[PDB]
C-alpha cells in the first residue's frame, strides 16, 4: 500500500535492531570482533562492522536513509562469510540465519520509504 511518512523508517529500524539483539544468533556480532581472540582478523577484513556501531550511527542521526543502514548490516554478514574457514562453521551458521531474518523484516521498511519519496515528488510545489 502507498505510504506517506518520509521519517518512519528510523523508528522501524530501532525496533528491528531490538529484535536482533534479543535473538541468540546475534551474540557474535553485538560488539566489534576482538583482535585478541582472532589475531589475523584485519589481514582478511578491510572494514569491521557490528550491531552496536549500527545502532550508535542511527541514534547519532548519521544515516540519511534506511538504504545506508541496510548496507552496514549487510557488511556484518559478508565479513562473517569472508572470515569463516568453513561454510559449516558455528559463527557463519549464525550469521547466515540472522541474514535471512533481517532480509524478511527490512523489505517493507525499504518499500515504504521509497513510496513516501515518490509521494513527496508528486507534490513538489513550483508555483510559489
Curated annotation (Swiss-Prot):
Tissues where this protein is expressed: Expressed in myeloma and epidermoid carcinoma cell lines.
Q: Which residues carry this modification: Phosphothreonine?
A: 47
Disulfide bridge positions per record: none
**Localization terms from the record:** Nucleus
Residues modified to Phosphoserine: 3, 93
Where the record annotates domain Bromo, the positions are: 4-109
Summarize the disease involvement recorded for this protein: Chung-Jansen syndrome: An autosomal dominant disorder characterized by developmental delay, intellectual disability, autistic features, anxiety, hypotonia, obesity, and dysmorphic features.
State its role: Probable regulator of the insulin and insulin-like growth factor signaling pathways. Stimulates cell proliferation through regulation of cyclin transcription and has an anti-apoptotic activity through AKT1 phosphorylation and activation. Plays a role in the regulation of cell morphology and cytoskeletal organization.
Oligomer and partners: Interacts with IRS1 and IRS2. Interacts (via bromo domain) with acetylated lysine residues on histone H1.4, histone H3 and H4 (in vitro).
Record's protein name: PH-interacting protein
Q: Give the organism the record lists.
A: Homo sapiens (Human)
Tell me the gene name.
PHIP
Q: Which residues of the full protein are shown?
A: 1315 to 1440 of 1821
